[PDB]
Amino acid sequence: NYKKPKLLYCSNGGHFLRILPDGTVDGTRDRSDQHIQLQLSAESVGEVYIKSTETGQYLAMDTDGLLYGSQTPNEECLFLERLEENHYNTYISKKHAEKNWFVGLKKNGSCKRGPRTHYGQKAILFLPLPV
Amino acid sequence: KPKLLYCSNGGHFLRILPDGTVDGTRDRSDQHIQLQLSAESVGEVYIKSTETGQYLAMDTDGLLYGSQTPNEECLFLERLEENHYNTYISKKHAEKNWFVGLKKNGSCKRGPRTHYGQKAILFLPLPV
Amino acid sequence: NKRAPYWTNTEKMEKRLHAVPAANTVKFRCPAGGNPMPTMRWLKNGKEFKQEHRIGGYKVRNQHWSLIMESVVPSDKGNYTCVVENEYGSINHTYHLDVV
Amino acid sequence: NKRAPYWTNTEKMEKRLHAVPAANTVKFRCPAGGNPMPTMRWLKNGKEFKQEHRIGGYKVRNQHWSLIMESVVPSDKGNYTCVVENEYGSINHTYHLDVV
Numbered sequence A: 001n002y003k004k005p006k007l008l009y010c011s012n013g014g015h016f017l018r019i020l021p022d023g024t025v026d027g028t029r030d031r032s033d034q035h036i037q038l039q040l041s042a043e044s045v046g047e048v049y050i051k052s053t054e055t056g057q058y059l060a061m062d063t064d065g066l067l068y069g070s071q072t073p074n075e076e077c078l079f080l081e082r083l084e085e086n087h088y089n090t091y092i093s094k095k096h097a098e099k100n101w102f103v104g105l106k107k108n109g110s111c112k113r114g115p116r117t118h119y120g121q122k123a124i125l126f127l128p129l130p131v
Numbered sequence B: 001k002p003k004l005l006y007c008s009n010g011g012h013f014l015r016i017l018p019d020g021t022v023d024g025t026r027d028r029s030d031q032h033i034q035l036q037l038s039a040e041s042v043g044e045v046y047i048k049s050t051e052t053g054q055y056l057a058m059d060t061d062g063l064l065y066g067s068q069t070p071n072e073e074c075l076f077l078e079r080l081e082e083n084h085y086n087t088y089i090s091k092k093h094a095e096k097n098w099f100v101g102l103k104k105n106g107s108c109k110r111g112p113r114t115h116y117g118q119k120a121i122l123f124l125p126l127p128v
Numbered sequence C, D: 001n002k003r004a005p006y007w008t009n010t011e012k013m014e015k016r017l018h019a020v021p022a023a024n025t026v027k028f029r030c031p032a033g034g035n036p037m038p039t040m041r042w043l044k045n046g047k048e049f050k051q052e053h054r055i056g057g058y059k060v061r062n063q064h065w066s067l068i069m070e071s072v073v074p075s076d077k078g079n080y081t082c083v084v085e086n087e088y089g090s091i092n093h094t095y096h097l098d099v100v
C-alpha cells in the first residue's frame, strides 16, 4: 500500500501515539502536533521498529513495562505487529513477548504499562492512519 | 432465609411486579423484592416473590417474567462463582448459557444477550 | 425543576475521532438528562440523517442514547452530530467518522 | 471562564450501593471538571479518611478521580463521600459500601 509516515491511532480513547523530545510517550488528539508522525519498518515481519520522524527517537519498552523513546534503535525497540481479527493492529514487546506486553493507551491519553495490558482491551488496538 | 437479590451491574435488587414483569429497583423499601429461593439442589433453584407468590421464570425467547405456578421454565442453576458472586442459568436453556441478568438501567437483559464475563449476571443475595 | 438538557457522561464523549476499519460496526453515544426527558436525533454532516441515506440503514437506541451503524463502508465517512432537546433547550456534540 | 466543579460522569455515579463480598476489592469514582481543575478528598461516615484508618490503607488515583480499597473486610462497611472542590465551590456524592 503506502510504507510511510503513519499516525498510530489507538481506538481506546481516540489518541495518536506521541514520542515527546524528553523521551516520554503518550497520546494526544491534536493532528497538528509535530511529535505524532511515525515511520515503521521490518525485517520481518511483523517485527517493527516505530520511530518519531521528527526526532529520530525509537519507541521502546523497559523491563518494567514502561514505554519510553530511545535515540539508539535496539533490543527493547522491536515489536511484534499482528493484524488482528479486527482489523486492528497490536504491538507486543519482542523482548517481553512470553508475557504479552502490548503497547497500549489509557482513555486519558497516557500509556498503559505492559503488565496491565492483555488481549481483549480497547487500549491495545491501533490503526495506522495517513498523515 | 428470605433474601434480596442484588445485582452488581448497576446495584439493583431483582424485582417481580404483580403485572408479571421482572426488573430492578434501588428502593430498599419496595414490597416486591423479597425473594425466597429453594432446591431440590444440588444447585437448582426456584426464586419466588414472598409477597405475591409468583415465580421468576424465563420464556423461550429469553425474556424473564413471573408465573403463578412453579414449573420447568422456573428452574435455575445457581453457581457460586469464583468471585464470589452467584449466577443463575435457565435450566431449560442451559445448553445455551442463558443467565438471569440486569442492565445498568434497571431493565432485565434477555438470555441471548448475556454471557459469562458481564457484570449484569452477578448477584449477591443480601439479607432483607 | 423544569431543566434544559445536560450531558450525563462527558468522559465517553471526549473521544471525538472515531477511526474504524470497514466492514466493522460503529457506535456513537451522548447520554443526557433533562426535565422533561429530552429527545434525540442525528445529523450527518449537518443535515437530516434518514434510514434511507445508507444501505442497511442504522439503529438508534433511545434507551442508551446511541446511534449504531453496522458494516461501515467509505460513504459513511463524515461528521455525526447528536442533538438532544427538550422544550427548555438543546445540546449537541459532533463526532468524526473515518473508515479505513 | 472561572468555573465551579461539575460531575463529568453522572451515569457511573447512579450506583450508590456497592454491595461486595470480602476479600474483594472496590473502587469508587467521581469524575469531575472545573476551572481551576478541582481537588478531591474522601470522607468515611462524614469524617477524614486517612491511611491509618484501615489495615493496608487505600489508594486514591487522582488521574481517575477514584478511591480504591483492596481486600475489603466488615470494618469497611460505611458511607464514603467524595468531596470535589475549587475556589468557586464544591460538589459531593456519597456511596454506601456493604461487605457480604
Ligand SMILES: O=S(=O)(O)OC[C@H]1O[C@@](COS(=O)(=O)O)(O[C@H]2O[C@H](COS(=O)(=O)O)[C@@H](OS(=O)(=O)O)[C@H](OS(=O)(=O)O)[C@H]2OS(=O)(=O)O)[C@@H](OS(=O)(=O)O)[C@@H]1OS(=O)(=O)O
Pocket (backbone or CB within 6 Å): A012, A105, A106, A107, A108, A109, A111, A112, A113, A116, A117, A118, A121, A123, D027, D029, D061, D064, D065, D066, D067
Ligand atoms: O484492568 S485493566 O488493566 O485490564 O484495564 C481496564 C479495566 O481496569 C479498570 C480498573 O482497574 S484495574 O483492573 O486494576 O486495572 O480501569 C482502571 O484502570 C484502567 C487501566 O488503568 S491501569 O491503571 O493502567 O491498569 C483504566 O482504563 S483504560 O486505561 O483501559 O482505558 C481506568 O482509567 S482510564 O479511564 O482509562 O484513563 C482506571 O480507573 S480506576 O482505577 O478504577 O479508577 C476497569 O475500570 S473502569 O475505569 O471503570 O473501566 C477497566 O475495565 S473493567 O470493566 O472493570 O474490567
Ligand SMILES: O=S(=O)(O)OC[C@H]1O[C@@](COS(=O)(=O)O)(O[C@H]2O[C@H](COS(=O)(=O)O)[C@@H](OS(=O)(=O)O)[C@H](OS(=O)(=O)O)[C@H]2OS(=O)(=O)O)[C@@H](OS(=O)(=O)O)[C@@H]1OS(=O)(=O)O
Pocket (backbone or CB within 6 Å): B009, B102, B103, B104, B105, B109, B110, B113, B114, B117, B118, B119, B120, C027, C029, C061, C063, C064, C065, C066, C067
Ligand atoms: O457486554 S459487557 O460485559 O461488555 O457489559 C456492557 C457492555 O455492552 C455494550 C455493547 O455490547 S452488548 O452488551 O453485547 O450489547 O453496551 C450496550 O449493551 C449493553 C448491554 O445491553 S443489551 O440490552 O444486552 O444489548 C449495555 O450495558 S449493560 O446493559 O450490560 O449494562 C449498554 O448500555 S449502558 O451503558 O448500560 O447505558 C449498551 O449501549 S450501546 O448499545 O453501545 O448504546 C458496551 O457499550 S457502552 O454502552 O458504550 O458502555 C458495554 O461495555 S464495553 O466496555 O464496551 O464492553
